[PDB]
Every structure is written in structure tokens, then in C-alpha cells.
Amino acid sequence: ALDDIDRILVRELAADGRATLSELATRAGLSVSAVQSRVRRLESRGVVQGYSARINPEAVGHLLSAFVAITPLDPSQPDDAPARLEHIEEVESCYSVAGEESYVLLVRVASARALEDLLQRIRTTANVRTRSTIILNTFYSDRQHIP
Amino acid sequence: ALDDIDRILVRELAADGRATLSELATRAGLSVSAVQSRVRRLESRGVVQGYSARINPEAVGHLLSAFVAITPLDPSQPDDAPARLEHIEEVESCYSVAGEESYVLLVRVASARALEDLLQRIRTTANVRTRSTIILNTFYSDRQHIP
Amino acid sequence: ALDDIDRILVRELAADGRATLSELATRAGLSVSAVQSRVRRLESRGVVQGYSARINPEAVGHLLSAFVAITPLDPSQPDDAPARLEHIEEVESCYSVAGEESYVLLVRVASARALEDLLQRIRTTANVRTRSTIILNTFYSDRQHIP
Amino acid sequence: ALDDIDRILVRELAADGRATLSELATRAGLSVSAVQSRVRRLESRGVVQGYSARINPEAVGHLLSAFVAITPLDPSQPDDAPARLEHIEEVESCYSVAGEESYVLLVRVASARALEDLLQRIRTTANVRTRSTIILNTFYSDRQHIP
Amino acid sequence: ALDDIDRILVRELAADGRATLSELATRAGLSVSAVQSRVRRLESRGVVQGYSARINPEAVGHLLSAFVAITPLDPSQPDDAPARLEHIEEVESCYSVAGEESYVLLVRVASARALEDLLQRIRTTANVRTRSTIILNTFYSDRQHIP
Amino acid sequence: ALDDIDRILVRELAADGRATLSELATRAGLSVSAVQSRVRRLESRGVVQGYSARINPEAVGHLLSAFVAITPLDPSQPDDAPARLEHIEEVESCYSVAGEESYVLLVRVASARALEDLLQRIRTTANVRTRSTIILNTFYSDRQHIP
Amino acid sequence: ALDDIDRILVRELAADGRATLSELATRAGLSVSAVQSRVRRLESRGVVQGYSARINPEAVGHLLSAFVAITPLDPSQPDDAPARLEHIEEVESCYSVAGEESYVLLVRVASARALEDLLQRIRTTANVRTRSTIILNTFYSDRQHIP
Amino acid sequence: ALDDIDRILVRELAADGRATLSELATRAGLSVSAVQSRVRRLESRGVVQGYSARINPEAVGHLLSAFVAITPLDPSQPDDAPARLEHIEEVESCYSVAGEESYVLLVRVASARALEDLLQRIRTTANVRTRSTIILNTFYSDRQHIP
């Protein structure tokens, strides 16, 4: 189940993470107390994982973003590249994929020259070849969809 | 233009977008009023683009996710694709990209058959060839970094 | 459910489609009557779809096999290429795929020159571009696996 | 060397691999003995490679299927890959192929996570890079053609 | 249908297309008349397609040679390309090919600027994209093999 | 120089390698003796290298032709692959190239299965990776052009 | 001819474009008058075309450089893209090439977002598709070599 | 840090690297001393990297130029390639690059055979595969832009 009182709830919270427990209950058709409980059970079972403000990465000094596709060099070694790159803070996302490469990373960085640095560090730390695709512009990002 | 105080606020709001104004105040050593007003300045400039609950896409029924790279079947018609795809709700992100392809989308769907139907809708609404890379697992995503 | 009397049954029938209703029941641990009923319910619900002898295609005049990957040319038209190629007998399999192309076909043919013919016919009949990969040798084929 | 009679037998056994010897006899206009003995000749020469029940892979739990093209991480060591992959039961077929890649496998698995684990096993047991093409739907397969 | 005698004749005429009928006669152990008439049979069937002096392309002024692979800018219009390129004299060969491209040409020209002008003529007369592979040196060519 | 009495001469001999020393001199505007001398100096300085009949390779058992592109595996070893493959008779041409690969071969062979054999032999004898492109049809071949 | 008094002269001027007419003549072994004349005849016949200081493009606001490979969309139109892009100042170099694309440009730009702009302008002004490769770092550039 | 005056100086020295100090002075409205000293500041900071005569590569005997993209045969050994190629004089530039390849070189040579010999030297001194793109014509190059 995902009871569809919760459908409207997660819908509302995806468009507005600061939407107040009060103003939810009006559009939501429940008691300020019922809503508040729902929202708490939704986090407990992992339906909402977190609340985040969406930061413009340019405004914070990240003028170059890229997908970096990686493939381990040695298949006789354990394939743990996500755990090995997890400490590198400019990797924002890491996915295993069915494609040409084993994983895809999304990475943000100060400039073209910093990307070269980061790639050398990704290569030597995980034990991977890199193939990168530079993002020129983000038209929209995390528009979460609740059916 | 971003001082040390704004850096703390954007960093905390990244870690927790429901942080109360009083909690932010006592972490930045300001009054609740000075916090509110600094947060509002951030919002009206580029810096904070909104606030979102992070929803588990598996729990709402998106069991398959994919990257889809797209390129114009005919590269004359000036480039429309992000605008025209904006009304497909299963597209969650859209980036233009350097290299052989012009945009990369991330898309979320219920199953393999729903992925085929969606790739058709994308080919036809943007007039585009598609190359799809199914995601097998997300190790971590959205982990925002304030330098 | 797939009751695992049926596991051994489908296992046995995948290795030997002519295995007799008799000799099954010994290895199968059931009455010749029980087995015979099982096997009949297995076909009714679509678990076994057919029985086929495996024909060597070289021995029958098919000296060249190929995967032919296809993508419709016009995405404003209905995408019905499987139904349109279904009458072409040298297409042995047709799959929709998540990749560079929309579908993959496996095709068998008398020679390199007949492949060129077949491709021109696939192109004009479905409305598709073709990309083909020639099979040099089949090491093994349909080794069906029952967990 | 294949006369008209053998053509009828291989065609009927393709359409129905459990056809009884008497049914084959009366369709070829032979005795049941002459059928048996012609069928046995077909089997001992190249022509009929075995008989198999066609199992629905979704009903036994293989909900994901994929093509995986593989190429040697080091193309010296003489080519071993089909032999070494023979003991991975989720590989159902293996073809060598002309072009940039050396073999194409068809593989069947329970889910996305089981696909990642399998691609690891394949990279390591054959020492190979992999490029994966997930299948979304089978419109028809195995439809054998006797000219 | 090719006996041992025809094999000797086609092999000698491969090594030396000006071999005199008497020289061929005494090598096949036939009369000059039986040679003539066997050679004529070869010519009127598929077997001998003509006779050519092998010219040094550098000595007549073709200092640059290249392979050009071509693919239709629009793959509907049924395939015309070999017919339409037949009247460009600098194209010396034309093969259709499996894979991503549809034909491969070998082309010979006086210089780099004459190569650019020719690639334009090819793009426009066949309506095709081109991918060019310049030849640096011919180690041996045309070495025909009669098994 | 290539005196353009020789232009017509090499032109005539490229279209007809058996064209008689007699019938040349009429179209050629010279004495049967002058022509005969020209032709002999043309072979001496390497302008005409040979005379060959053009054999249909299908008719002689070569039902599959391919370009096979090769690149040495070890760049610390001398790069002598042309000299090492020269004894393999099914390689009809070998070129060094400016492209993705170091050389391109044209190869003819009895079937798809024989190609696989030949490739394994090319790999182990030169020390090369292979990438092959199968020829489906030859529209025309060695139309030599004399400006 | 390039008299090899001129070899040393052009060698000297390639390493140092401001090298004085005086200090040349010492290392150069000529009269300050002879050198001065040489240098003037060298510019007249186009051996030296110009003198330029080498500007760091980062230092001047060009934080992102790229090769942009282009191919005209319509081969029935005159192919004049160099003349059409010549007014766009961020194109620093334009070459016709033998490859996948018709031309290669080197382009410099303020950022990733400005590159997207520039590409849209290259597309609509010449009539071309674009494929771009981002330069991460220049290790060395115009080391001119005089044999 | 670059004022309006420095912009004029770098722009004029781009157009003419032999401009005399007095000519620069009267264009910037400064004394010859203030010019010298501003030019020296530019040189000692990043801004002016040297001065070069632009030599016609055809007139000194480099009749063939090419882009060569290179990628490590083994991507572990930390990346050495620019350092190791620095001593090959026919390499004029070296850039690292995002995407499938790691560096792009521009190379100049006397002929096709000298290009093959050079690609060998490059494969072996950096341990790299190469992909070559011959240049047919330079329409304009080095046209520096000060914004």
C-alpha cells in the first residue's frame, strides 16, 4: 500500500519541502494532528528520506558539471568503486548502469582544469578508466513525479 | 557575492531543508529575524531554488530508471527539445551536453513496457533518436557540496 | 506459485522435449497419471508454450545469420515494425530493446548477397534504418535455465 | 544431402517436436519404421540437434533478459571466452560476431541487482569488457524457417 | 561447375593475363583450340570478368588514395548510391557492407585539395555522409587466390 | 613526364589487358613497332606492373569477403604485420592507413565460419587485434582512372 | 630552395618573435644589413606571415576551450562554412579534415553556458551539425619545428 | 587583474608582436617607459607567454598535418604522455580532452610515409592507441581574440 492520503502528502512535500504541517492539512483534508503523524510514518518507513534545499551550483563556485562514466580496470579485484569514491565530495551521485560502462557519476567542479585533477584522482583511487560528458546547461532537475 | 554567514546557511539548508529559523539562528550566531531576511535574499537571488522532500522512487512505484541521451533527427529546427519534453512527467531532469548527443534525460517509469512506451513518446514529441542506459542501482545521489 | 514438482518437470522437458510421459514419472517421483496432468496444466497456463526440434540452420541452407538492429525513420507514424515484419520468414526473432536502436532481429539467410536483399526489404517494408552484426559461429544456443 | 521427405520431417518436427512417429508417417506417406529410421539419420548427422520444451522465462522467474556483447581485455590469450562462460547457467546463448566486439551473449536473470552481479561474474570469468542491451519485450522468437 | 583444367587456366590467367594461348595449351596439356574454347566458356559464364593492366597509381598522378565509407542522409529513398557514383571517375570501387555504414568506396586523387573537392561531390551526388580513411602505403594489393 | 602517347596506351591497357600490340597501334596512331617499344619501357619503369585477368571470387569458392582492420597489440615490438601476414593467401590486400586502426586488409574466404578461423590466425600470427567489416556485394571494382 | 641561412633565421624567429635584427646577426653569422634583407624577403614570399605574442586565454577571460567538429546539413547547397563563420570571433581556427566531420574549429569561450550559445550560433549561421570535444588543459601549443 | 591599458597592449601585441615600444606608447597614451614596464609585468604574470614568428609550414616542408587523438593502452600508469612526447619535435601541440580519448596532438610531417613512421613512434613512446585525422586545408588559424 501507499494510501493516497499519502499520495497528496508526498506530492505536496516534493513541490515544497518547507510547506508547514498547518497549511498541508487544509489542501490535505486532515487534522493537523493526523497529517503530522502520517508525515512521521512516511519518514520511518523510507518513503521520504530527507529534506533538502536545492542549491544553484554555479552560485557556489561549481561552474562545470559532468557525467563521468567509469569501468574497473582489473576484473579479478572486488568491484567496490562506489565505496571507494564515496569520500570524494565532488561526486554528487553514483549509479551502476547497463551500458558500455559500469557506473555513471555526476561530478561538479570549479573549472575544466579542476576536472582534469578530479579525473586523475578518480582513476587512481577507484581503479577505473574514465569517460566524461560535460554538462553545458541544466534545463530542470529533480522534478519528482508521484503517479 | 556570498559571505561566511550565507555559506553556513546554504550548507545547513542542504543538510536539512526543514531546519527551523531558530535552529539556523543559533548556528549562525544571529537573530531569527536576521536569518529570515538573509534566507529570503538567497532565495530571491540565484542561490536557493526551492525546497524538496527526497522521495524514494521505488516506494511510489517507479521501479525502473534510465538515462536517455537524445539527438535531433533534423538539427536545423532551432532547439526545442527541453521545452517540448517539459510536459512529460516522467522526465525528471534534462541537461544539454557536449559531444555526439545534445541532451541527456533522466526518466523514471513503472516497468520495461512502460519504458518502451515512454521512449516512443520521447522520439515523437521531440523528434529525436534516443540511446538508453538503464540504471541498476543508485548508491547515493544528490549529495550537495558547499566548498 | 510454481510448485517444484513442476521445477523438475520443466527442467526435464527443456533438456528433452521428447522425453516420454512414462520415463518422466520415474525420475519425477509421480504416477504416470499425475505427471500427465501436470504437463497438461503447464501448457494451459502458459509455462510451456510449444515443443520444438532444434534444427541446424546450416544444414538447411542458412549459411549466414545476423542480428539486425532497426530504428523507425519517422517517429510521427505508429511504431508497429514487429507486426509489419512478422510476415518475413527469415526473421526468426524480434525484440524491443533499451539501447541505440529500437529493436533487434535475428535473421538467417542463404548468403551475404541474400542479406543485402533482405535488408532492403526490411527497410522498405517496416520504415526503418538497419544496422547489422554478422554471426560467425553459434557456440550454444537456448540452454534454458530453471532455477 | 536432404531429399523432399527429410524436408517435411524437419519442418513438422520444428512445428511440433512431440509429434508421434505415426502422425509423421501418415504426413510423409511412409511406414512408422521408415520414419523412425529417417528421423534417427537426421539426428546422427547435423540436422536435428535435440528437442526442447519452449519455457516462458517470465513464469519461471527470469523477469529481465539482456544481450551482452563482450570483448577481451587483452586479445592475445587465445580465445577462451565461450568455454569459460559455459559454466554460468544464466547465459543461454553465445555467438561470435564480426565488428568491434567478439561475442554476443543472451542472458536471463531475476532482477536489476541480479543483472549487476552477473555482469561482474562475466567480466571476471572471461576477462572481458561488457556492453549490455536490456530487452524490454520479446514479440516472437525461435520461429524456425525450413526453405 | 569448375574442373581441374579450368582451375589451371584461371590461376595462370590471374598470374599473367597476356599469357598466349599456346603457352596456356602446353601447361594444361591441351590443344590451342581446346584452350581458346575453354577460356571463352569461362568468359561467358561468371568466371573471368575481363583483363586489365595493373597501373601504378602514383606514376599517373594519383598521389592520394582513400577509403570512404558512406551512409544515406535519408535512408528511405531506395538505394541509389552505387548507380549515381558510377559517373565519378575517381571512384575506383564500391562495396556495400554490413554495420553502421552502407557502402565503402576506394577513391584516388591528386592531392589533399582534390580530396576535399571530391568528398563534396560525393556528399552531393549521393546525398550521403562520408567518413574518410586516407591510405599511407599499399604493401601489396590484388593478390588473387585460386584454392 | 608521362608523354601522352602513353596516356592513351595505359588507358587502353587498363580497359583491356589482352588488347593486341596490333589493334593498339590503330586507335594509338603509332607503328606496331613504336607501340611495342613504348609498352616495354612502360613495364621497365614501373608504370604497368603486371597483367591480370579479373576472377569472380564467388565462382571460385570465396562466398564471403571482408575488410579486416588491425592494430598491433604491443607497440614495443617492431611493427612488421604486413611482412608477417604476407604468407597468408587469403589476404588479398594490405594497406597502412590514417584512421582508428593501423592497417586495413581485404580478405576472402569460403564462409562465415572460415572467417572466424582466419581471424584467429591473423591475431596469433601478426600480433594484432581485429575489427572486421563484411562485404555484402561488389558493385564494381578496379575501374582504374587515367586523367 | 630555402637557403639554410634562412633555416637558422626562421628557427630563431619562431622561438623569439622579438629577437632584435642586431642579436640575430651574431648567432646568425651575417651583417646586420644582410639579415635585415633576408627577413624582409622571407615576409614578401610568404614564409613568415606575421608576428604574434602568445596570449594566455584564461588570463583574458576564456576559461573553456573546445574543438568543435562540424558537417554541413544540406549537401545540395554550396559548402562555404569557413567563409560564413569567419565573422565569429571566438572561432580561432578552422580546418577542413579527412575524418567523420568536414571541418574542425578551435573555439574559446567564457564558460560552459557560453559554449552552448556559441554552438547554437554556429549551427544556425553555417548550416551545420556540431560535435564538440572540450579541452581540459593545454600542455604546449605552437612549438613550431624547422627541420 | 587587467585594466583597460593592459587590454590595448595585449590586443596590439597579438596583432603585431614586433610592435615597437614607441608605437605601443603612442597608442596607449603612455610614455615608452611606462609601456616597457607594463609589458614586463604582463610577461612575468601569466599573460604574454612569448612571442613567435608565424611560419608557413608548407614552405619549410611540412606538407601534411594531422590531429592525432591518443588513449593509454593501459590507464593505470599515471599519465605521462605529454611529458614523454615532448621530445618528439614533430608534435606541435598537446591538449588533454574530455570524452573517449585523453589527449589530442597536432602533428606536422613531410609526407604520408613520414606520417606512418611518426604514428609508430607515438604509439611506442607513450604506449597509446592513436586515431588520426588528416588536415586537408587550414582556412585560418591562431586568430587570437581579446574581449
* Concatenated DSSP letters of H13-82: HHH-TT--HHHHHHHHTS-HHHHHHHHHHHHHSSSEEEEEEEE-TTTTT--EEEEEEEEESSS-S---HH
C117 touches chain E (CB under 8 A): no
Triad E76, B85, B93: Cα angle to 5°: 120
Residue pairs between chains D and F whose CB atoms are closer than 8 Å: 19
Measured CA angle at A90 (ends A84, A94), to 5 deg: 55
- From the CB coordinates, do chains A and B have 3 or more pairs under 8 Å? yes
Instruction: Check if the beta carbon of residue E56 is closer than 8 Å to that of residue F49.
Output: yes
- Find chain F residues with C-beta within 8 A of C115's C-beta: 136
Minimum CA–CA partner of A134 in chain H? H98
Q: Which residues contact B119 (CB under 8 A, 6 or more apart)?
A: B68, B130, B132, C98, C102
What are the chain D neighbours of A71 within 8 Å (beta carbons)? Answer: 129
- Determine the 3-state secondary structure of H138 from DSSP: strand
Residues facing E105 on adjacent strands: E68, E94
**Does residue G56 sit in helix, strand or coil?**
coil
CA distance F98 to F110: 30
Beta-bridge partner residues of D104: D69, D95
CB atoms near residue E35 (< 10 Å) = 22
Q: Which chain F residues touch E16 with a CB distance below 8 Å?
A: 50-52
Overall resolution, Å: 2.5
Amino acid letter, F41: R
Do G132 and A136 touch, CB atoms closer than 8 A? no
Distance CA(E96)–CA(B45), nearest Å, equals 59
Report the distance separating Cα E70 and Cα E104, nearest Å. 6
What are the chain G neighbours of B76 within 8 Å (beta carbons)? 73, 127
Contact G15, G142 (CB under 8 A): no
Q: C51 to chain B, minimum CA–CA distance in Å?
A: 27
Question: Best mutation site among D71, D79, D104 for testing chain F: the one with the most F CBs within 10 Å?
Answer: D79
Contact of D92 with chain C, judged by CB distance below 8 Å, is answered with: yes
Amino acid identity of E92? E
The domains located in chain C, with CATH, are 3-54 (1.10.10.10), 55-135 (3.30.70.920)
> Euclidean distance between the first and final Cα of chain D, in Å?
14
How are beta strands D64-72 and D48-55 bridged, if at all?
Answer: unpaired
C26 CB-contact burial (10 Å; exposed 0-12 / middle 13-18 / buried 19+): exposed
Nearest chain B CA: its distance from A22 CA (Å): 14
Dist CA E42 CA E38 (whole Å):
6
Fill in the amino acid letter for A54: R
Residues 65-84 of H with CB under 8 A from A: 74-76, 78-79
Contact between residue A6 and residue A30 where contact means Cβ atoms under 8 Å apart = no
Q: Are D131 and A99 in contact (CB under 8 A)?
A: yes
> Hey, is A133 helix, strand or coil?
strand
Q: Is E41 helix (H, G, I), strand (E, B) or coil?
A: helix
CA-based R_g, chain E, Å: 20
Q: Residue C134 corresponds to which amino acid?
A: I
Place of cell 526551492: B50
Distance from C-alpha of D113 to C-alpha of F60, rounded to nearest angstrom: 52
Q: What is the 3-state secondary structure (H, E, C) of F58-78?
A: HHHCCCEEEEEEEEECCCCCC
According to DSSP, the β-strands at A91-98 and B91-97 are unpaired
Residues on chain F touching H106 (C-beta within 8 angstroms):
none
**Gyration radius of chain A over CA positions:** 20
Residues of A in contact with D124 (CB under 8 A): 75-76
Give the β-pairing of D64-72 and B103-109.
unpaired
In this complex, the residue of E78, E98, E99 whose CB is nearest that of residue C124 is E78
The Cα G90–Cα H143 span in angstroms is 9
Beta-sheet strands, E only, within chain D? 48-55, 64-72, 91-97, 103-109, 128-140
**For residue F5, what are the CA distances in angstroms to E51, G98, H29?**
21, 35, 71
Q: Which amino acid is at E22?
A: S
The answer to whether F86 contacts chain E (CB < 8 Å) is yes
The residue to which cell 598521389 is assigned: E63
Residue A80's CB: how many other CB atoms inside 10 A?
12
Burial of H131 (0-12, 13-18, 19+ CB in 10 A): middle
Strand residues in B6-109 grouped as ranges (E): 48-55, 64-72, 91-97, 103-109
The answer to whether A26 contacts chain B (CB < 8 Å) is no
Q: From chain G, pick out residues whose CB is under 8 angstroms from the CB of E133.
A: 98
Buried/exposed code over H63-101 (b: 16+ C-beta within 10 A; e: otherwise): ebbbbbbbbbeebeeebebbeebeebebbbbbbbbbbbb
Closest CA to B28 of B50, B20, A20, A61: B20
How many CB atoms sit inside 10 A of residue C81's CB? Answer: 22
Alpha-carbon gap, residue E60 to F1, rounded angstroms: 9
Nearest to E131 among G75, G96, G100 (CB): G100
Question: What is the distance between the alpha carbons of residues G77 and H13, in angstroms, rounded to a whole number?
Answer: 39
The number of beta carbons lying within 10 Å of the beta carbon of residue G70 is 25
Q: Minimal Cα–Cα distance from H62 to chain A, Å? A: 32
How far is the C-alpha of E122 from the C-alpha of E134, rounded, in Å? 16
